[PDB]
Symmetry: none
Subunit: 25 residues, 4 copies
Amino acid sequence: SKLLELLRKLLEALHKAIELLEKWG
Amino acid sequence: SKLLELLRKLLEALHKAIELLEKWG
Amino acid sequence: SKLLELLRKLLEALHKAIELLEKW
Amino acid sequence: SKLLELLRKLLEALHKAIELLEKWG
């Protein structure tokens, strides 16, 4: 459960980073 | 990217299902 | 009963998604 | 520049997390 939760949060962080990159660049 | 996005959405679905199972029952 | 089955199907779907990563 | 650095590190973490998931899941 902890690894899956880690993965979920990390994928969500990646998604936000990509969204930022798209906006500011 | 498409497969990672699928995985994120699936993990988010799983998390909601677990929250529901904690609430009801 | 329906919620437990839903959880099982979701976990089965996740298992398939992980098998795809191993290939590609 | 730093945002691309952030992205690169998050992707490297993701690679490691997926490897852990594959070995034990």
